[PDB]
Design a protein around this ligand. Structure first.
Ligand code: CDL
Ligand code: PLX
Ligand code: PLX
Ligand code: PEE
Ligand code: PEE
Ligand code: 8Q1
Lengths: 70, 88, 55, 84, 128, 178, 124, 103, 459
């Protein structure tokens, strides 16, 4: 069902341009898809919501009294 | 598979090729019927190295008992032909 | 499109006093999602085997 | 239909140790007083289309150039279309 | 010197690490020669009967029949009541039975008691 | 495989077998061809430094330390040729090997196809029938009294004779029957 | 993680057990004590039959997200906005959970400080 | 080492016999003597005999025999969202509680 | 019930008045027709029974066994046609007469409304089997085998008779219907314990029980193919049928008295399955597999729950069919190789592919592959045992694993690998053997479509 490619015996095997162009096309398609998704959707990897700092929360909003009120 | 049905001529040519690429033998004095021990002055270590080269070049293993009594390129070719069942 | 779900208990096989055994198929998300994947993979496998096992 | 083309072997004088790692193997072997006799049997592995190699990362980046060009053309076209 | 390989039942000694092969004697050599003689005589008889064009059946093998007869029918006439045999038979043929009887009896007595107090929760237990 | 085994292996045969095994296992360790060639030349050199030892006791004390060292560093997963007794395609095609006598059980409608093959088969069978009667006598007269000592067979001596016990060596199915 | 190192290598009573949190009254901190607000009712949140573990204070955005996905079946990519609203509400919920954790940790710190101060005063 | 002369001769004779046998294994141009005796189109017929007929049979069997009995086919009670209206009754589900929309 | 009994009796004059070369054809055709007629007993009721007369009655436990008994005779004739070729017409007629008498006694045994009539026929089956084993067996051990197969049986069956008459001297009747309707509890007494033992041991020895199974390997190995088929398929089930009938008078004493037999069966199934792994003879391996399956049936009957009884009935039918098929395959190999050693003839797939397919399907049914009736009975018994005690699952699963192991070991040893070189008399499989194999196996895969036919009276 393919083409006729004869053995070579110690040289580089014969290559059709069809397989080369298909392999290059699919590698380029994979890299283009990765770049396109990274450009449009960067937060799928980096995240969208910043992580809060618990040490930066003031004692007021957490209901802390200075050790004598309650 | 698609492996060509190799013939005696191909086996002979390939065996002589491997032997001429062994630099302890001068290729011009090499012949199919030349003995390894006396016609070329090789040690038994050289003979087992040649058997290993034949194995690595034809892709199959020759057992020690059969390999240790193969002393000519012609009988190496004959052994390979018998193992692979070559017609001509 | 919808999230459509079925149980298809089509053939009633033996019934064991209070236990009924029937040929029933569950067609939930897992089945309807895994079947196309398995069929696609098997299609590729068979096309590959037409070349790998030719001899 | 099979591969019956009467393949002929290449010349045996073609293979040389020069310009291959077998050369430096022979050099280091000569530093201790030995020689490699099967070197030319392996020269064909460094000679033809096998002479040039590619790195692991280079193998990973097989189609980065033309895919990157497609990416930049696509993003530029989208920027031009949406600015309307 | 390198770490020593210690043979076991299921990982035997290699042939190339066997001290007996390195200790050669004329008696050892004649033993090997006559072992090869026995093997060659057997091989010759087998091949003579095997290549015969007139033969149209199974080649009878006395060794196989000896093996099967020893495995099956030679056991009891060669049996003797021995402390080893008696203890092994008693253990391996009675101990498992009484062990399983104890296990199942204890489990079922516990189940029966729990049913008596009613604290088993046998709800939806219809088929038995 | 083909050659009949001997009663024992001589010291030289043991040394050569160790040489081959060590080289193969070093190839398994040294994957690349240049590295393997360098280390194999070193390995050959290390064999060669005791090539000329005259003391058999010394030579037997050697090869023993050597096989111990081999067993220590033997690459527990060596490379095996695919068709070798440890390979991944060792006995792959044994299920396709059918004996030649099975053709005798074919229906006449099956033998109607391939008539030339079965005519040649009949010729071969006749040749076997006559050659066997010659072979039995030749083997009986050539074997030493008391039975054979080595399982090596003689060739044909006369013009029309065939090698004794040849039928099942000549009529092997094939290396890859299907 | 840093909290694990302070609970496994430091003092166990210094930081909460996540199983038993909280260990203090809610209105202990400040007397306001506002209630949490739920938008989705019993019936609609049942009828959408989301999941038992999706039935939280974020349910309404999930409802909207589900509806958007259903109407635009062919254009799956179209309902980007609904997803953002839902993950933002989940982010706020997680931030509130972190605030509860830090709050209880600070309350535990202050309680240990009060008890050690009282012990010092009593021994003096 | 090497072959003994008898070993050479026996190997050579066996080799000639084996090669003649192997050559005799070949087929003549007429060797498969076959006894003859009898008594989009491909895709179109395939999609009829392998897709259309089975789906016809299964649809008939499900619609007229399986569905005849109760509880044989049970569906999911599709999801209801606020603002939806129902085909059977026509009533409209009320909307939600107008939560504050900001960011 | 006479519409089945009378044709089976007429099989005898028809056999003895036949031509010298028509006995097999006539016997096979009319036995098949009798099987077809008997197939109409399967129309059972949800109520009591098919009470034909004062002497014979049918039940949905008896009907599958009757149909299997009627179906086994044509297969036995087809299997016996080969190795009886060189024998005189009178002796072949005698062999067919023995088979017909065995069928007649089994048919009357399975209906047998009376317990004494059941005992008489249940012991009358002994004579034809003994004659078949000790007359048309090959090896010299057959006589010894016959002796075992005799005395074991009687050693169990003589006390039962005494017990039986004792019951009628106290109850006043031994009719099964009257016994069932007028049943009364057994008090925990020494006399009642010995009555229980006398009632149980006769059926236990013919299952066989694990400790009492010595006669079975000998009798099955030394018997001809028809003898092995009838021994494994129908004769082993007499003990199970008798226990299922007789346990109605043994309550509540069965609760205590079942423990030693339950332990013996649960451990002996493991023991015999393990024995199968190391066996150098095909027939002995099949016999030990039969012992394991019947141990499972013994457990099921001793538990005496509805699921237990249904599983036991299904397993009895499935085991009969599967073991008959396995013995037939072994005999097809034996008639070619004449050795009966499993390791001798190897790689028979490359020479007999269709017979290899038959071997595979027989091993699959022996392995209890779902949804076969073998697994239906297996699973019902296992679930009943689990309800009886949750720890039985370890033994049951271990038995399943070992069963699969030895079934596939038997398949791989004989069919796979490389053919033996020196064996050149392996002829192509005959149409008779392939037809025999199909006639074994299609009923199994076709019964898996209608399981309620073989699930017994508690379905
Ligand atoms: C899966 C769906 C199938 C639908 C199609 C209908 C098939 C009807 C088959 C009926 C039974 C077959 C008769 C047995 C003897 C075989 C005759 C023969 O020699 O072949 C000659 C013929 C010609 O070949 P050849 O070249 O001349 O011979 C060369 C050699 O013989 C070399 O030949 P080979 O190498 O090709 O081997 C022969 C082949 C055939 O030999 C066999 O091994 C067949 C027997 C396997 C069963 C073993 C017993 C275990 C219990 C299972 C009971 C199921 C029965 C259900 C009711 C059946 C009613 C009778 O064996 C196999 O290939 C191994 C298959 C392993 C299957 C294991 C899976 C079992 C469970 C599957 C599901 C069942 C319940 C589904 C429930 C849910 C769905 C509704 O070959 C065939 O035609 C092949 C037979 C078809 C393959 C059967 C595999 C599945 C069928 C299962 C039974 C029916 C399923 C019902 C559900 C439908 C929906
Ligand atoms: C070669 C490659 C394959 C080619 C062939 C392709 C076709 C395959 C199709 C056949 C197998 C697929 C399974 C599908 C089964 C369809 C038929 C089935 O549904 O009918 C069964 C019916 O069959 C019977 O139930 C099973 C047959 C009984 C077997 C009796 C054995 C024959 C006697 C032989 C002697 C006995 C020896 C053993 C002694 C015990 C179950 O039907 P059921 O829903 O239930 O009720 C019947 C109809 N009602 C409702 C009107 C009552
Ligand atoms: C060998 C291959 C297998 C063959 C078949 C094996 C199966 C046979 C097993 C017999 C079943 C059980 C027999 C007796 C069971 C009674 C319960 C007894 O075991 O428990 C104690 C019984 O105590 C002692 O056992 C008393 C008897 C002691 C003598 C017995 C001999 C012990 C070993 C003999 C075994 C040999 C079997 C083979 C004989 C040839 C409880 O004592 P107690 O509650 O107060 O009295 C209960 C009985 N009552 C209520 C009727 C009064
Ligand atoms: C084929 C070409 C012919 C096309 C014309 C027929 C078109 C369909 C019309 C069929 C008529 C309807 C019908 O089949 O009747 C129902 C009838 C069931 O009988 P009932 O009595 O109604 O209930 C079962 C218990 N008594 O349905 C059928 O038998 C047909 C389809 C059955 C289901 C398919 C079975 C395939 C698997 C075989 C059994 C496998 C083993 C059991 C597995 C157990 C799993 C728990
Ligand atoms: C495979 C070989 C097994 C051999 C046989 C195994 C079965 C043994 C069962 C006992 C045999 C005889 C039992 C009697 C038959 C039942 C009759 C009956 O139940 O009547 C009893 C009678 O009970 C007896 O007489 C029993 C006596 C038993 C004597 C023989 C002992 C045989 C060996 C005993 C030890 C082994 C027992 C179990 C062995 C199991 C098989 C291994 C009560 O009636 P009455 O006495 O009139 O009323 C009470 C008021 N008077
Ligand atoms: C990487 C895996 C592990 C590797 C470690 C193994 C270590 C092996 C190194 C040990 C050194 C030795 O040679 S061990 C010393 C063994 N004894 C002798 O060498 C005495 C005489 N030599 C011979 O007879 C030979 O055969 C010879 C003449 C060379 C050829 O003979 P031919 O003329 O008949 O070919």
């Amino acid at each position: 069902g393919g083409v006729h490619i004869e053995p070579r015996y110690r040289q580089f095997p014969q290559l059709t341009r069809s397989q080369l162009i298909q392999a290059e096309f699919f590698s380029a398609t994979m890299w283009f898809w990765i770049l396109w998704r990274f450009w449009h959707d960067s937060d799928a990897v980096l995240g969208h919501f910043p992580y809060p700092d618990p040490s930066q929360w003031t004692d007021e909003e957490l209901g802390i009294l200075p050790d004598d009120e309650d | 598979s698609d492996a060509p049905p190799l013939t005696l001529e191909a086996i002979k040519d390939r065996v002589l090729y491997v032997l001429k690429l062994y630099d302890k033998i001068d290729p011009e004095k090499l012949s199919v019927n030349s003995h390894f021990m006396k016609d070329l002055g090789l040690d038994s270590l050289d003979q087992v190295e040649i058997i290993m080269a034949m194995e690595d070049e034809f892709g199959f293993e020759i057992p020690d008992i059969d390999a240790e009594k193969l002393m000519c390129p012609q009988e190496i070719v004959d052994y390979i032909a018998d193992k692979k069942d070559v017609y001509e | 499109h919808t999230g459509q779900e079925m149980i298809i208990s089509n053939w009633h096989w033996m019934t064991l006093q209070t236990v009924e055994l029937s040929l029933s198929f569950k067609m939930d998300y897992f089945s309807v999602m895994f079947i196309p994947v398995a069929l696609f993979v098997t299609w590729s496998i068979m096309e590959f085997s037409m070349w790998y096992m030719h001899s | 239909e099979h591969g019956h083309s009467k393949m002929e072997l290449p010349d045996y004088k073609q293979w040389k140790i020069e310009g291959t790692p077998l050369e430096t193997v022979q050099e280091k072997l000569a530093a201790r007083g030995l020689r490699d006799p099967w070197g030319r049997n392996e020269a064909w592995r460094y000679s033809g289309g096998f002479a040039n190699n590619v790195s692991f990362v280079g193998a990973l980046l097989k189609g980065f150039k033309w895919g990157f060009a497609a990416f930049v053309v696509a993003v530029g076209a989208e920027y031009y279309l949406e600015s309307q | 010197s390198f770490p020593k390989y210690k043979p076991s039942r299921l990982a035997t000694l290699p042939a190339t690490l066997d001290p007996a092969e390195y200790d050669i004697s004329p008696e050892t050599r004649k033993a090997q020669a006559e072992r090869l003689a026995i093997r060659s005589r057997l091989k010759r008889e087998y091949l003579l009967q095997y290549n015969d064009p007139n033969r149209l059946g199974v080649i009878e093998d006395p060794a196989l029949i000896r093996w099967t007869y020893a495995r099956s029918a030679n056991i009891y006439p060669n049996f003797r009541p021995t402390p080893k045999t008696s203890l092994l038979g008693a253990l391996f043929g009675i101990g498992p039975l009484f062990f399983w009887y104890y296990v199942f009896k204890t489990d079922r007595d516990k189940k029966e008691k729990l049913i008596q107090e009613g604290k088993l929760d046998q709800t939806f237990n219809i088929s038995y | 495989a083909f050659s009949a085994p001997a009663a024992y292996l001589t010291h030289q045969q043991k040394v050569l077998r160790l040489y081959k095994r060590a080289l193969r296992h070093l190839e398994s360790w040294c994957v690349h061809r240049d590295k393997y060639r360098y280390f194999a030349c070193l390995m050959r050199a290390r064999f060669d430094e005791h090539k000329n030892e005259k003391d058999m006791v010394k030579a037997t004390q050697l090869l023993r330390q050597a096989e111990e060292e081999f067993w220590y560093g033997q690459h527990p997963q060596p490379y095996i040729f695919p068709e070798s007794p440890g390979g991944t395609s060792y006995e792959r095609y044994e299920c396709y090997k059918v004996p030649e006598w099975c053709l005798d059980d074919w229906h006449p409608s099956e033998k109607a196809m391939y008539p030339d093959y079965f005519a040649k088969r009949e010729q071969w069978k006749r040749l076997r029938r006559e050659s066997w009667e010659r072979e039995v006598k030749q083997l009986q007269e050539e074997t030493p009294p008391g039975g054979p000592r080595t399982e090596a067979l003689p060739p044909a001596r006369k013009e029309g004779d065939l090698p004794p016990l040849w039928w099942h060596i000549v009529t092997r199915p094939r290396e890859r029957p299907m | 993680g840093a909290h694990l190192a302070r609970r496994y290598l430091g003092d166990a009573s210094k930081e909460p057990d996540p199983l038993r949190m909280p260990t203090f009254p809610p209105d202990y901190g400040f007397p306001e004590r506002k209630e949490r607000e739920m938008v989705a009712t019993q019936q609609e949140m049942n009828d959408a039959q989301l999941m038992l573990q999706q039935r939280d204070y974020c349910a309404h955005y999930l409802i909207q997200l589900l509806k958007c996905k259903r109407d635009s079946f062919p254009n799956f990519l179209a309902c980007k906005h609904e997803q953002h609203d839902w993950d933002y509400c989940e982010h706020l919920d997680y931030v509130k959970r972190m605030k509860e954790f830090e709050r209880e940790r600070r309350l535990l710190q202050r309680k240990k400080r009060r008890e050690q101060r009282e012990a010092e005063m009593a021994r003096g | 080492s090497g072959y003994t002369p008898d070993e050479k001769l026996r190997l050579q004779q066996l080799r000639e016999l084996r090669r003649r046998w192997l050559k005799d294994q070949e087929l003549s141009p007429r060797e498969p003597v076959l006894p003859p005796r009898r008594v989009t189109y491909r895709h179109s017929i395939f999609a009829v005999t392998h897709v259309l007929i089975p789906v016809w049979i299964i649809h008939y069997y499900l619609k007229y025999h399986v569905t005849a009995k109760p509880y044989t086919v049970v569906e999911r009670k599709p999801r209801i969202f606020p603002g939806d209206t129902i085909l059977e009754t026509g009533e409209v589900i009320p909307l939600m509680k107008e939560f504050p929309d900001q960011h | 019930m006479l519409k089945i009994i009378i044709p089976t009796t007429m099989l005898l004059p028809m056999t003895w008045m036949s031509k010298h070369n028509m006995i097999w054809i006539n016997a096979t055709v009319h036995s098949l027709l009798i099987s077809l007629i008997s197939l109409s007993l399967l129309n059972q009721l949800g109520e009591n029974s098919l009470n034909f007369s004062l002497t014979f009655f049918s039940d949905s436990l008896s009907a599958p066994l009757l149909v299997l008994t009627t179906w086994l005779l044509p297969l036995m004739l087809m299997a016996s046609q080969s190795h009886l070729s060189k024998e005189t017409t009178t002796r072949k007629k005698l062999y067919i007469t023995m088979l017909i008498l065995l069928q007649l006694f089994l048919i009357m045994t399975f209906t047998a409304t009376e317990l004494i009539l059941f005992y008489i026929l249940f012991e009358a089956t002994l004579v034809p089997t003994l004659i078949i084993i000790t007359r048309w067996g090959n090896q010299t051990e057959r006589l010894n085998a016959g002796l075992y197969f005799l005395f074991y049986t009687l050693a169990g069956s003589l006390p039962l008779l005494v017990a039986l008459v004792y019951i009628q001297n106290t109850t006043g009747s031994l009719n099964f219907l009257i016994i069932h309707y007028w049943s009364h509890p057994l008090s925990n007494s020494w006399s009642n314990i010995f009555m229980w033992l006398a009632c149980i041991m006769a059926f236990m020895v013919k299952m066989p029980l694990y400790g009492l199974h010595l006669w079975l390997p000998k009798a099955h190995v030394e018997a001809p193919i028809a003898g092995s088929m009838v021994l494994a398929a129908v004769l082993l089930k007499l003990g199970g049928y008798g226990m299922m009938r007789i346990t109605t008078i043994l309550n509540p004493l069965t609760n205590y008295m079942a423990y030693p037999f339950l332990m013996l069966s649960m451990w002996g199934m493991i023991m015999t399955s393990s024995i199968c792994l190391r066996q150098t003879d095909l027939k002995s391996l099949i016999a030990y597999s039969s012992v394991s399956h019947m141990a499972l049936v013994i457990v099921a009957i001793m538990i005496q729950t509805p699921w237990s009884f249904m599983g036991a009935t299904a397993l009895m039918i499935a085991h009969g069919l599967t073991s008959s098929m396995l013995f037939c395959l072994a005999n097809t190999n034996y008639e070619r190789v004449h050795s009966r050693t499993m390791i001798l003839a190897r790689g028979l797939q490359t020479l007999l592919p269709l017979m290899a397919t038959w071997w595979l399907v027989a091993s699959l049914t022996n392995l209890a592959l779902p949804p076969s009736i073998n697994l239906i009975g297996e699973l019902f018994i296992i679930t009943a045992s689990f309800s009886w005690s949750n720890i039985t699952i370890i033994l049951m699963g271990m038995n399943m694993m070992i069963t699969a192991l030895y079934s596939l070991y038997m398949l791989i040893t004989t069919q796979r690998g490389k053919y033996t070189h020196h064996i050149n008399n392996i002829k192509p499989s005959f149409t008779r053997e392939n037809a025999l194999m199909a006639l074994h196996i299609l009923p199994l895969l076709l019964l898996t479509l209608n399981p309620k036919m073989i699930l017994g009276p508690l379905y």
